[PDB]
Ligand binder design. Structure first.
Ligand SMILES: Sc1ccccc1C1=NCCCN1
Ligand SMILES: Sc1ccccc1C1=NCCCN1
Ligand SMILES: Sc1ccccc1C1=NCCCN1
Ligand SMILES: Sc1ccccc1C1=NCCCN1
Ligand SMILES: Sc1ccccc1C1=NCCCN1
Ligand SMILES: Sc1ccccc1C1=NCCCN1
Ligand SMILES: Sc1ccccc1C1=NCCCN1
Ligand SMILES: Sc1ccccc1C1=NCCCN1
Ligand SMILES: [K+]
Ligand SMILES: [K+]
Ligand SMILES: [K+]
Ligand SMILES: [K+]
Ligand SMILES: [K+]
Ligand SMILES: [K+]
Ligand SMILES: [K+]
Ligand SMILES: [K+]
Ligand SMILES: [Zn+2]
Ligand SMILES: [Zn+2]
Ligand SMILES: [Zn+2]
Ligand SMILES: [Zn+2]
Lengths: 369, 369, 369, 369
């Protein structure tokens, strides 16, 4: 039992610019603002709580090591990598393509450290040095497909880690479980034709991107059946999320028998997130993490690696993240101070529409060989 | 056609403290933050957009006039008023009772100007000087019951205005239509026994407060039937909101024949709000405002007054508010720059659960005489 | 008589980026920050204090009118104007030349409104509609020479106004008195060869720019003797500033007999400014303003226009500015709450080195004909 | 040899409130602001630069250990300690006495960790585990006298450390060299009657407090001659500071033969600080640190401990601090990006008034036995 933990100062230095989502724009009358929705303070506050709560005393700090070009090319095209070098070299950086994905000057260094944090943690868990870990990286990854940056994501951190586990560590089966509230379209794209990386995305239906994450997106060729989307309706809370875990996610992992589980651990499904409409509380995320860790213990000798994705509440994300860290360490030493305030708002009963959305995916489990 | 508009510099100076929601607390490890959820910048950004968009050129600025003790006592107890004087006198102000409602030093001055802005606009619309208007006040009002402050609200601005319209202007029937996403429990309380102020609250069920806003809360004594709650499920969007307007809210106003309609105009039902789970877009609020203004035109000679309640997206609230102002002026000169980004997320189809929640209230319309 | 006052919402929307002074730069390890030194909140806090103090009740609000190309060309080259049109188009804007002068996207609109606010106030004062006024503009002007932007300045607002007074209003003599703590090199450049605009700059010696503001910079040709620099040593306070006013500045104005005095009113000489080392307090600025307004009363029918330049203390600048406004209105209704705290730090005794610096300029007064 | 480095997350969580200096106050029209002058982000940016620069790779991280009551009582009265326990309990904390010294809720924990960080580093240096170090603590210490908090300081961190070195480690002579720009009145008070701790304060004359730091304040009784104030005039830069080091400070240390030198290392003498008027650059602080470390090498086996005091430029302080760290490690791997910009402003020539202020202290050196 040794739990790795990755933070790097530069994860807190990502320059998201002076816009809200897209850039500030005077003609549109979008006024500049200090904190973009994706500002790094949200994840830094999580890190600072890991330290200040004393959880750090039960963690093994792991240094991020910059992802090399070779590491990045296991998940992305050469053209994408060169375009990010170009944007990073600009004097104030710039948008990377989709209009909502700012990279600051020098920002490629941070993107390499973000992917490299995931790779390093993956290596050190796979060897058995560590039993598990949490890589609290930034920028996030799961929207970046093979040939582009998208949705705040420069490189697909979990796919860079999976590619390393496949090519360098020789694993035959890896699973990426993404519970960020937005569809993991990038991860889906990268491994679309590939049955050696099972890609699962539990998300709010059509939240982002606008036209993907349908249950009918199942991969292609030898990868057909090895991508599983679980779109849920807006307003889904702990009951829906836990029913999805029990009915779809955990059974899929059991069927697939991955040698490593990489969790795309976003907290933007939280009750207070501005960028989705879900109702998960810190206790929900706690139960999700407990279940997933215990699943890995039953199937891949506990080799599970958590890698930070999204989440946009600087107020509440830290407690959602701390709950997951506590499940890794087994030291449960701080309450969620919002628990009573949020527990009264609901999401705690499985609604028929939520149940039906989840049941749509159950017949696809039989195609996971 | 003259449209009043109230802003006051001090509305932007409300001191919400250094906490997120409750105060910062080191033992709980709730780290201080610059912007409380209810920080005044959100509403100031709305005001600045009204100015910068050029909408101000079509508005008649109306000065707020501080609410007197007599004005406040038409909605609140003497004890509540004295307690707010006490808190306001403290060197750094303080919480007002419920643990989430900070008032800064001197903050009673701002609370008086907030209620007084609503009163002044009400007076000047009622006389016919103005045909309608928008009072962009802060702090908000609708959670404050007769004997307390609650939920960011010091005085119940719309109830102070209604009380003025009743006692000073001699109106026999006033309606308060609250579409803030949180239950208008304070307004409900103040007029509970009183059929001369019809109180309507369209809100997310059990969002805040945790134990109120049920359809069974209908008033008492001669006021029985003159409070109408329309609790909606999390994830409700434009289709639900507009169906609620058409099936319940507008028919209630038509039945009641108010001499003045006061709209508790919050924008925390927006798609990007952290403090609720609804999916209304600026175009939704636009349609809601158009319908309500046109209703007043058919029943109380256009005497409608909008008074700002909540809303917590500094990014998006300004465009939701601008849409309402544009419906008042009839000058539609700026797009919502988030329209396409949010329109793909949904809420645009009336779901069965949403429809059923709304239909629960229809049989109560017959009791409005 | 009537005192004009210019503010525009867009003055508060200038996008100063994510750097401190220059841009953020990751290889230099210059971490992004929310508020650049020149962030518009400093001047907005001054405006909000003018409102909240009640001073606005004694002022005549004057709308800014965008400076036309013709207006701009009275102070600047066509090449500079065309370059500003070009940069204003960049999607996130960018630096204009010197590495410390960011213009946001569409930012030329704001630059035109800033220069235009100075012109419009000048027009109304010079025509006798108003007796005097204060144009609280942003971005500032005095570092922009004929053919460039520099030092946060896009156009030379006071020189645009002086050019208007000369060419449109037919004034033969105008004076620009700049008491921003940095040398008014732009103004000096524009009117270098021209005796019809007397340019005076009281500043900290070599603060910015690093190689200008020497007493030997006196103009050329017909303009020789019609530029006066008064470089003062670091640590100069009220005594030095008032001695400079009495010994050099006011005598220069009296000798010249301008038909209009334009004051480049920066507050970066204040005791708490990060961008200079001077010790002026709000009472200092009060006395400087009183002296200058009284001079104007005796030499040009009271025609004096104040135009905002720099100042970088969001804490203290508002009180320095308010003191000047109070001298214009004659209504002295709020104390400087920092008065006792700052008065104890000194600067209230004229030091020999300060006296000597001032006395260096006295022999140059005889060349003002 | 090994260089210790202390940071603690909670140093960055000090709640400085919503005022600028004193609290926000509505009747005074002192508008709330996000960042108080003393906001903890300034020192956190220094810490993050130590990390991001790679300097941390050459440092031995040292955990802060909370100062005990016994530790605190070596510098402070029991009454003061008990008062701090009392205030720490207030739900939002509050001012401690002087109207500019906010302690957040539970804030005594942070005050203990700040003093404790200084003690722990002192212990490890004095025992020979480490050769030297830097304790980047917050809140600061040097204004807190025996019986009070003052000037943002709860406990006198360097005096707690000196008291520990005396009583626990058995040192007979300790020196505290304070180059924070404000007079170290607290330190002066604590050791006033005591020749076993030589207290030296290099500061801007009468900057803060307003009535102390005169050269005539020399201690009393057996301590007479063992307090040395070096008040310098406003506008003093590198030349004055280095002349003071060479003529007074280093000779005083050599005369005294301390067994440990503790440096009260503030950076508020920097060229860009809002809270003083001095002109020191990062290269200035570099040279001051180099001189002092080399002095320690020749008089007390290199036993030197730096403890953070003030400094209020979030932009520039990090580079001033990093320069000191680089002198400790001997690894000079990042330039000061402001070097050329600031070097042009001056302070690099010793002015007569600066020289004279320094020379006033030289005759006092002979009384250090
Ligand atoms: S998390 C942290 C934060 C600030 C200072 C030190 C640490 C820390 N890092 C790893 C060892 C235990 N503590
Ligand atoms: S994930 C799993 C895999 C292999 C065997 C069992 C489980 C499991 N699933 C649900 C109940 C607890 N454990
Ligand atoms: S909304 C506004 C904002 C800043 C400056 C002036 C105005 C304004 N107020 C009322 C008249 C038209 N403009
Ligand atoms: S609110 C109203 C009141 C009286 C008469 C008609 C209406 C009305 N209601 C729905 C359709 C448009 N107008
Ligand atoms: S300065 C101001 C600020 C906010 C709202 C109104 C005003 C105002 N403007 C001009 C007339 C008197 N008051
Ligand atoms: S303009 C002037 C210049 C130098 C000295 C005095 C004045 C002056 N000020 C006001 C009263 C009469 N004149
Ligand atoms: S300074 C730092 C900051 C963020 C994450 C890790 C470290 C760090 N701490 C001590 C060992 C080397 N690096
Ligand atoms: S401690 C000292 C004091 C005054 C002058 C020189 C030194 C000194 N510094 C380093 C080399 C030898 N001694
Ligand atoms: K796959
Ligand atoms: K997902
Ligand atoms: K009622
Ligand atoms: K409501
Ligand atoms: K000239
Ligand atoms: K100047
Ligand atoms: K002493
Ligand atoms: K000092
Ligand atoms: Zn997400
Ligand atoms: Zn609300
Ligand atoms: Zn300046
Ligand atoms: Zn200091």
């Amino acid at each position: 039992h040794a739990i790795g933990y990755v933070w790097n100062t530069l994860y807190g230095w990502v320059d998201t610019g002076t816009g809200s989502l897209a850039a500030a724009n005077l003609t549109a009358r979008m006024q500049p603002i200090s904190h973009h929705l994706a500002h790094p303070d949200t994840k830094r506050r999580f890190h600072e709580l890991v330290c200040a709560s004393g959880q750090i005393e039960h963690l093994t700090p792991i240094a991020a090591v910059a992802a090399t070009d070779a590491d990045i090319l296991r998940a992305h095209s050469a053209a994408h990598l060169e375009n990010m070098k170009r944007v990073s070299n600009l004097p104030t950086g710039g948008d990377t393509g989709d209009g909502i994905t700012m990279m600051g000057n020098g920002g490629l260094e941070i993107a390499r450290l973000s992917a490299g944090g995931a790779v390093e943690l993956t290596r050190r868990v796979a060897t058995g040095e560590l039993s598990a870990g949490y890589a609290l990286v930034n920028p996030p990854g799961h929207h970046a497909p093979h040939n582009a940056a998208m949705g705040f994501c420069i490189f697909n951190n979990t796919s860079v880690a999976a590619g390393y586990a496949r090519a360098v560590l020789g694993m035959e089966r890896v699973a990426i479980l993404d519970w960020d509230v937005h569809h993991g379209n990038g991860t889906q794209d990268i491994w679309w034709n590939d049955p050696s990386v099972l890609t699962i995305s539990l998300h709010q239906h059509l939240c982002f991107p606008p036209d993907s994450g349908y249950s009918t997106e199942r991969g292609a060729g030898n990868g057909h059946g090895y991508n599983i989307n679980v779109p849920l309706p807006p307003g889904s809370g702990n009951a829906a999320y836990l029913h999805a875990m029990d009915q779809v996610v955990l059974p899929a992992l059991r069927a697939y028998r991955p040698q490593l589980i990489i969790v795309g651990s976003g907290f933007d499904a939280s009750m207070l997130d501005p960028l989705a409409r879900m109702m998960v509380t810190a206790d929900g995320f706690r139960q999700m993490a407990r279940r997933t860790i215990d699943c890995a213990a039953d199937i891949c000798d506990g080799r599970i690696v958590f890698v930070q994705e999204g989440g946009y509440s600087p107020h509440y994300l830290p407690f959602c993240g701390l709950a997951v860290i506590e499940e890794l360490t087994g030291v449960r030493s701080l309450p969620d101070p919002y628990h009573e305030f949020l527990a009264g708002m609901g999401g705690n009963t499985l609604l028929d529409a939520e149940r039906a959305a989840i049941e749509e995916i159950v017949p696809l489990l039989a195609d996971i060989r």
